[PDB]
Amino acid sequence: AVFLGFLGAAGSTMGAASMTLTVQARNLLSGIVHLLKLTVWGIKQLQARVLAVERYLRDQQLLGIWGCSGKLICCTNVPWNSSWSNRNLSEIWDNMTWLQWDKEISNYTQIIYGLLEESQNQQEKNEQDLLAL
Amino acid sequence: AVFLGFLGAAGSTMGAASMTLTVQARNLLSGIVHLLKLTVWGIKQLQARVLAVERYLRDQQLLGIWGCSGKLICCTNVPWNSSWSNRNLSEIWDNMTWLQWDKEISNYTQIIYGLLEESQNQQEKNEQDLLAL
Amino acid sequence: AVFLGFLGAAGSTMGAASMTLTVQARNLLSGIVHLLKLTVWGIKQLQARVLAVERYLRDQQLLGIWGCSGKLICCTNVPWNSSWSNRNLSEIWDNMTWLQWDKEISNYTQIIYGLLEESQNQQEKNEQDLLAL
Amino acid sequence: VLTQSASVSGSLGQSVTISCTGPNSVCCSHKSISWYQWPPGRAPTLIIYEDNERAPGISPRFSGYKSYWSAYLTISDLRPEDETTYYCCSYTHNSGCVFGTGTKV
Amino acid sequence: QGQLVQSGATTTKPGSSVKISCKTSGYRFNFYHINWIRQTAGRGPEWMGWISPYSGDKNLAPAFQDRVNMTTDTEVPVTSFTSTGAAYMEIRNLTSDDTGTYFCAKGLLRDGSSTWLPYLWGQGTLLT
Ligand SMILES: *[C@@H]1O[C@H](CO)[C@@H](O[C@@H]2O[C@H](CO)[C@@H](O[C@@H]3O[C@H](CO[C@H]4O[C@H](CO)[C@@H](O)[C@H](O[C@H]5O[C@H](CO)[C@@H](O)[C@H](O)[C@@H]5O)[C@@H]4O)[C@@H](O)[C@H](O[C@H]4O[C@H](CO)[C@@H](O)[C@H](O)[C@@H]4O)[C@@H]3O)[C@H](O)[C@H]2NC(C)=O)[C@H](O)[C@H]1NC(C)=O
Ligand SMILES: *[C@@H]1O[C@H](CO)[C@@H](O)[C@H](O)[C@H]1NC(C)=O
Ligand SMILES: *[C@@H]1O[C@H](CO)[C@@H](O)[C@H](O)[C@H]1NC(C)=O
Ligand SMILES: *[C@@H]1O[C@H](CO)[C@@H](O)[C@H](O)[C@H]1NC(C)=O
Ligand SMILES: *[C@@H]1O[C@H](CO)[C@@H](O)[C@H](O)[C@H]1NC(C)=O
Ligand SMILES: *[C@@H]1O[C@H](CO)[C@@H](O)[C@H](O)[C@H]1NC(C)=O
Ligand SMILES: *[C@@H]1O[C@H](CO)[C@@H](O)[C@H](O)[C@H]1NC(C)=O
Ligand SMILES: *[C@@H]1O[C@H](CO)[C@@H](O)[C@H](O)[C@H]1NC(C)=O
Ligand SMILES: *[C@@H]1O[C@H](CO)[C@@H](O)[C@H](O)[C@H]1NC(C)=O
Secondary structure (H helix, E strand, O other): OOOOOOOOOOOOOHHHHOOOHHHHHHHHOOOOOOOOOOOHHHHHHHHHHHHHHHHHHHHHHHHHHOOOOOOOOOOOOOOOOOOOOOOOOHHHHOOOOHHHHHHHOOOOHHHHHHHHHHHHHHHHHHHHHHOOO | OOOOOOOOOOOOOHHHHOOOHHHHHHHHOOOOOOOOOOOHHHHHHHHHHHHHHHHHHHHHHHHHHOOOOOOOOOOOOOOOOOOOOOOOOHHHHOOOOHHHHHHHOOOOHHHHHHHHHHHHHHHHHHHHHHOOO | OOOOOOOOOOOOOHHHHOOOHHHHHHHHOOOOOOOOOOOHHHHHHHHHHHHHHHHHHHHHHHHHHOOOOOOOOOOOOOOOOOOOOOOOOHHHHOOOOHHHHHHHOOOOHHHHHHHHHHHHHHHHHHHHHHOOO | OOEEOOEOOOOEOOOOEEEEEOOOOOOOOOOEEEEEEEOOOOOOEEEEEOOOEEOOOOOOOEEEEEOOOEEEEEEOOEOHHHOOEEEEEEEOOOOOOEEOOOEEO | OOEEEEOOOOOOOOOOOOOEEEEEEEEOHHHOOEEEEEEEOOOOOEEEEEEOOOOOOEEEOHHHOOOEEEEEEEEEEOOOOOEEEEEEEEEOOOOOOOOEEEEEEEOOOOOOOOOOOOOEEOOOEEOO
16 A cells, blocks of 8 residues: 555645554654663663653553543544634645644644543543443 | 642542542643753652652553553442441542541452452453354 | 462463463562662662563553553454464364464464554544544 | 526625536536636636535635536625626546636626 | 736737746645636636646646646745745647636645645736
């Protein structure tokens, strides 16, 4: 088929990049990063090791508090406030790239992260009350 | 609304604290904890970094072997042996705090952790046999 | 009952070992591995700590990109190409051990890891299209 | 070959309905219809594509509809600037956009 | 955004072959097709053809099949998502019956069914 490679679809449309997410997901913790000798290269490599797991788990932490654990494409119950981006679907997924999309959605990325957070807290509270009978 | 803050409902009832679990969940790995210089403050901070991820994953490990991965309120199939606590529901969730509850359930916390563990091993074995047709 | 212990069923049949997976799952991150003093034993122990979490997460990373997050026995949609092993079920689960099974499936372990990877990427894309109505 | 309405008019507040049809060569159920607002001798404007999808910024009163034999363009709630000439267009994904005859509104 | 300035509106006489330019700004010139449209007075507006500033692939109507040369030169990176481009247009067995206003319009989307659709137009040029 195609298989562009790691970040190979960085310039492709959002919909086309949304079909090769495993390509980036698997390289978020591996690479080349057995004794711990504290030389100038050893201290350098140890930090490179702790830094990878740290950043990897911070993304999985947010993915957990949203109810999206172990997911690449999860859907939510947070509606799209058009003040975030009034662009239409066809001019988003068949037009923009993820890089320029993140550039314009950047202001509201912290707002959306809160709506996904409490929506998961209330949804799990709803599921518990439904299983109380 | 309310929003008491991190541990803000530590003195509230168990039911009231059971509505602000995301407030504590998100601060279990972040904070303020870019080169690795091994000075007295650098070694101190590196340990602070590894210690956070270590303790964070040990809780997620137990949460995984119970079938509660990425959950804040999951329900189980382990019935409540009244020898653990004969208190009633209304005098638990509308009365006690999580601190004093953990103080009296402390003896059986290792007993319950085993019942949730093998209940998940047997449940996944049941689901495999049900999908064998 | 039985309870052979950690790796206690290493020489048992695959089906018998497939009933005590929690026994190995819980010891993949604990053990005995509070200040960080960088002595010969301190540097040695710190590496032992980072090495455990690193290897633990690499297994959970693959378990995530396969849609098996927080699972001990998950079923997939990747059929068994008989060129991997033409052995029958009864002569696999009531005969072989996991050690000698991994010895003969070793060549195709990277092939299977790719089929489980893109099967999960396409399945989550299918679930999104089904919830688009 | 893609015939449009001869001409038609309305009034401020009312609505219009432009037509666009043709034979099996350029219409319809296996083709897409785009509606261009085109003042004579000026920069045109894309109003609606894919039979009924509006372009970014097009007023919601513009609406497209395609039957199995003729595409339509409704222009509800008229305004002064509506005095232009409209042209339909039939296309597929990998071909050209055969324009229409024209419609003075 | 996006701008497409066109060449001058000079005139020639039959038998010749004129070149029409179209300079783009405010958008990545490679990401969208470039269409050529003709609005004659003695005919309905005609789609002449589009070309790919990225892949070089061109597609013109059979009425212009062996009479028109469409060319574009490579863009110039201005920012990460902005570039300047240019598209060219020529006619072969040219007469005076091809008189009218000529426009250049870029594609609509980068993918889908309405990829090459003329969306953003130029100010046009008067001819013979
Ligand atoms: C980098 O950025 C560029 C620019 O944006 C991207 O190039 C664009 O890619 C998209 C998607 O791949 C293209 O959209 C498609 O357009 C085709 C129309 O082209 C067809 O028609 C040509 C003329 O008739 C024909 O010659 C082509 O056939 C072959 O020949 C060329 C010769 O060069 C060859 O290059 C082709 O690859 C062909 O092998 C061609 O078929 C259209 O058919 C598509 O529609 C189909 O697919 C969509 C889904 O994608 C579907 O919705 C439709 O219903 C239909 O099934 C589709 O619209 C676009 O034309 C490209 N060019 C632009 C925009 O200028 C490039 O992909 C980016 N790459 C990366 C890695 O980021
Ligand atoms: C959008 O967000 C603003 C504040 O960010 C809020 O006041 C408004 O009600 C929201 N509207 C919708 C439709 O969600
Ligand atoms: C595609 O995205 C760019 C980003 O700025 C935007 O300018 C352009 O209008 C979009 N295309 C369409 C057809 O809306
Ligand atoms: C984000 O905020 C900055 C603050 O100056 C503003 O300039 C910019 O336009 C904002 N962008 C969006 C998309 O809201
Ligand atoms: C409660 O636990 C004890 C041992 O801890 C056990 O002997 C007893 O059967 C249990 N009873 C119930 C009702 O679960
Ligand atoms: C827990 O064990 C200690 C051991 O001395 C005992 O004193 C205490 O009462 C026990 N508490 C409960 C709740 O069983
Ligand atoms: C088995 O795998 C080989 C390559 O590894 C492939 O060519 C063949 O089609 C596969 N057969 C089946 C039945 O999956
Ligand atoms: C694996 O590959 C080696 C390469 O020499 C080969 O000898 C061995 O037989 C192979 N085993 C299987 C099970 O394919
Ligand atoms: C278009 O003009 C260029 C200019 O050099 C020429 O190389 C090319 O061959 C021409 N195209 C055709 C189809 O003749």
